[model samples]
Target: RTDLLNVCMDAKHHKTKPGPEDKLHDQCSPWKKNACCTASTSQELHKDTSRLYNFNWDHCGKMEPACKRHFIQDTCLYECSPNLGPWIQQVNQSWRKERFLDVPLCKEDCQRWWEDCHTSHTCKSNWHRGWDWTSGVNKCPAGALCRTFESYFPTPAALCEGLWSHSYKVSNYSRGSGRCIQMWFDSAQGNPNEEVARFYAAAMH
Candidate 1:
């Protein structure tokens, strides 16, 4: 996986054009629509170096400083600046609203288990089958739920409930035996790099 510095540099490299999924245009006012929102004629979305607007490995670290420097001066045009503090807060607020609404933080012990298990060599086998209380070594702290897998791949058995099991099997387990393996709730569509961020964020919190 790419380090945060690499991600930031990548963002800088692709600064010309907006990402395919960036919604900056739709969110813009009518006057700015065509000139600012339209896709670049010279480059594809990923290749466009017109602007460095989207967040990725490259821009994530610069968020706070850029937001602080630019957000208040031009709320609409500069609100996404990486050096601005308020912009950073706004993005965090948006992220929390979109991704974590109604979700309480995991309990202390469960959170710890999440960290330990993911870092363990046998993370796949160590996963729990359900939101059971006794799956991890310690009980979840109050107010947070203990999350376990209903089923996962690479398990001992293969059945209807295990149709997606093959998805999580570590093909190179022999060489990296016992090393923590990455697990996602939906591996088929999951991004390992994003998963790395989400995992570290949860573990640290």
Candidate 2:
């Protein structure tokens, strides 16, 4: 059976499994009770020049604050959440032995992310790879044109499903449906994703 508490095999700073991270920073605090990433990773995700991935959110210029918040939340979910077992897949990559593919993302989350980011600029649709990292951070490749997020992603589904190489598929379900993962939630109610993951993981057989 897939382990619900496990972390990705090669993400830069993940623990083997989820556990208490009492001091998780800022946008990542939702997972403070059970996290795969350390406080340092959480802190780095907020930085423009984060050492965790050396990925720049403002590669096209300054990303709008409203749009950038969703990205931080997205990174927090990817790095900290331990409830993605159902979609984890083996991969033959130099850096990672496994990765999650096509995890069902709640419609509300995807739509909100797209809506808030519509005015932001980016050079790539899929941020999973094809980045220019010669300067220790992601930069637009030669000849690549920068444009608003709307130019690259026509709809919420196009943005959510295409970004990260299809790591997330836009689900028909909305938040509180318990059928998909919610990138943002009320941590006081516990992690809703845990049940969502369990439902899908049990169906894997």
Candidate 3:
């Protein structure tokens, strides 16, 4: 069921302290157009949203979102989560030129790219795994917090509707009954916002 939303009774209320960790990732910043994971252009990426989890586009280059805040807020709020994969170092220019053989070079091309790069360096398998995002801040900043949820159970309109939750379920409650109803869900127990925050906090420390 929705047991993932459960919380202990002793926990008083949700902690939304705006610590440094509450901030969004650089990729999530509007300045980079989501700094999308895809290697394709807006046109190609617009063609496929399922290509990657973070992939986002607006009408295939016709229009852009009002701001990158839309993507960042969703992942850096009440709840967030990230699954760590294997690590492959940055692919250099040679690897890009030789192994990443593909016209217009996309993330899919990175498969052969990583393989060739890895095989040449360590003679390992040419198969793909996972890699880390290049980071200067390194880990979560000091006092970084998720402003995590305190309780999952809900009774009154305030508990469920008063506080903005990232949970689509909570937002779904307001569907079609008012203006900008989707805005109702800006945070939640299992929402990706807090999930990412929680993930970064753990990772950074």
Candidate No. with top lDDT: 2
Count of residue pairs whose backbone atoms collide, per candidate: 29, 0, 17
* Residue 109 displacement (Å), model 3: 38
> Candidate 2 overall Cα lDDT vs. reference?
0.86
What's the CA RMSD for each of the models? 20.2, 1.5, 21.2
Selected candidate, larger TM-score, 2 vs 3: 2
Query: Which tens-of-lDDT digit does each residue in 109-178 have in candidate 2?
Result: 9999999998899988888888888888888997678999998898998899888889999999999999
As a whole number from 0 to 100, the lDDT of residue 43 in candidate 2 is 89
Please give, for residues 164-185, the per-residue lDDT of candidate 1 as tens digits.
2222222222211222222211
C-alpha lDDT of candidate 3 relative to the true structure: 0.23
Candidate 2 displacement at residue 19 in angstroms: 0.5
TM-score of each: 0.16, 0.94, 0.20
9 in model 1: Cα distance from truth in Å?
Answer: 16
Off by over 4 Å in 3: 1-54, 65-67, 77-205
Indicate the residue-level lDDT of 200 in model 1.
36
lDDT of 1: 0.24
Per-residue lDDT tens digits for candidate 3, residues 1-205, read 1221222111112122211222333322221221112222222222323232333222113222332233233322212111111111124442121111111111222222223222111111111222122341122223333221222112222222322221122222222222111211323222222232233234435
